[PDB]
Design an enzyme around this catalytic site. Structure first.
Site, short mmCIF file in Angstrom:
data_model
loop_
_atom_site.label_atom_id
_atom_site.label_comp_id
_atom_site.label_asym_id
_atom_site.label_seq_id
_atom_site.Cartn_x
_atom_site.Cartn_y
_atom_site.Cartn_z
N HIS A 11 -6.26 -7.21 1.09
CA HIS A 11 -5.38 -6.05 0.92
C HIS A 11 -4.21 -6.08 1.90
CE1 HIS A 11 -4.21 -1.96 -0.09
NE2 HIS A 11 -4.27 -1.62 1.19
N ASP A 47 0.83 -1.20 0.00
CA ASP A 47 0.00 0.00 0.00
C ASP A 47 0.87 1.26 0.00
OD1 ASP A 47 -2.93 0.96 0.32
OD2 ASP A 47 -1.90 2.02 1.94
N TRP A 48 0.62 2.20 0.91
CA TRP A 48 1.40 3.44 0.97
C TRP A 48 2.86 3.19 1.32
CZ3 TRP A 48 1.22 8.17 -0.91
CH2 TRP A 48 -0.02 8.63 -1.40
N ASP A 78 -7.81 -8.97 -2.62
CA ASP A 78 -7.76 -7.52 -2.55
C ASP A 78 -8.50 -6.88 -3.74
OD1 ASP A 78 -7.13 -4.88 -2.03
OD2 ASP A 78 -5.02 -5.04 -2.54
N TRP A 126 -13.56 1.85 0.02
CA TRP A 126 -12.45 2.02 0.96
C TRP A 126 -12.35 3.48 1.39
CZ3 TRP A 126 -8.12 -0.83 2.93
CH2 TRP A 126 -6.95 -0.10 3.21
#
Length: 310
Positions: free
Chosen positions: A289, A124-125, A260, A175
């Site tokens: 995810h 992710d980030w 995900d 989300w």
């Protein structure tokens, strides 16, 4: 200049399976008055260091099942909490959270701790930002463990890295809706929905850093940055692609959480092709995810793959 609050330490008193001792870094270059938390596990004089970066809306607690495996192999593990998350200080204004704010923090951390022989572990980030770090100081990086992530470049350069924003409706759209609209955002409930296999205790750990909404500016800003990418983010992310494609020559391992709806195969396969030498991905059928919740498997297999390529 940077109005921020700190989560009372008592909020972390009853964590589930998080026996890792706290470490702090005060007044990092460019971040005065801000205290950042990070885990530093395993042999401090180890040759290999696994830099585990978390995403939205979690913290180093997400890597709790991976840290022990990496540490037992004889490696050092560094798992920092981004400002606005975990035990790190939390700016109250969303305007203070930007792509470079979080990116420069990572660079400062790496310099301050003088980390070398780094195995970058992202998702992710942690990946949107993490993947842009090597090109700034390439000699410091050795390997890469990439779980559900990509680069925040523009839609034309890489449509796959923008398409998930609008479709499917129950993917990133849902989300972002869950994160930016609730007046009283409950992260334990959010995580139970997006990581259905978590126990009540584990979900509770994700709510721990946020006594109330005033502590959630960073949480609210992250999703908005995926949808609205500033010029700096686009330029940096685009340059990062060229790095992984033409400059990277280190060992790589990829794992995809197949359930995900945000950054699954649609994003991960195109990502695989852009990373020079990325092998066939390990597909985790039950993982969503938050692939790290099935991280013991990822950690073990990554180490096995790395050992067979030295």
């Amino acid at each position: 200049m940077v109005n921020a609050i700190r989560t009372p330490d008592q909020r972390f008193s009853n964590l589930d399976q998080y026996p890792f001792s706290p470490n702090y870094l005060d007044d990092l270059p460019g971040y005065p008055g801000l205290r950042a938390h990070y885990l530093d596990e395993g042999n401090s004089d180890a040759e290999d260091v696994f830099l585990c970066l978390h995403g939205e809306p979690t913290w180093s607690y997400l890597y709790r099942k991976m840290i022990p495996v990496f540490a037992e192999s004889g490696a050092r593990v560094i798992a920092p909490d981004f400002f606005g998350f975990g035990k790190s200080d939390k700016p109250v204004d969303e305007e203070d959270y930007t792509f470079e704010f979080h990116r420069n923090f990572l660079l400062a951390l790496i310099e301050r701790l003088d980390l070398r022989n780094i195995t970058l572990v992202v998702q992710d980030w942690g990946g949107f930002l993490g993947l842009t770090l090597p090109m700034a100081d390439p000699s410091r990086f050795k390997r890469l463990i990439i779980m559900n992530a990509c680069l925040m470049t523009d839609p034309v350069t890489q449509p796959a890295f923008s398409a998930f924003v609008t479709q499917p409706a129950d993917g990133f759209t849902a989300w972002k809706y869950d994160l930016v609209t609730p007046s009283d955002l409950r992260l334990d409930q959010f995580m139970k929905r997006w990581a259905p296999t978590l126990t009540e205790a584990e979900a509770s750990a994700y709510a721990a850093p946020f006594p109330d909404t005033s502590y959630q500016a960073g949480v609210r800003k992250f999703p908005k940055m995926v949808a609205q990418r500033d010029q700096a983010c686009i330029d940096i992310s685009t340059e990062a692609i060229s790095f992984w494609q033409n400059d990277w020559n280190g060992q790589t391992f990829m794992a995809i959480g197949m359930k995900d709806k945000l950054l699954g195969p649609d994003v991960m396969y195109p990502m695989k092709a852009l990373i020079n030498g990325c092998p066939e991905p390990l597909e985790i059928a039950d993982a969503g995810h938050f692939v790290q919740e099935f991280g013991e498997q990822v950690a073990r297999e990554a180490l096995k793959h790395f050992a067979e390529t030295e």
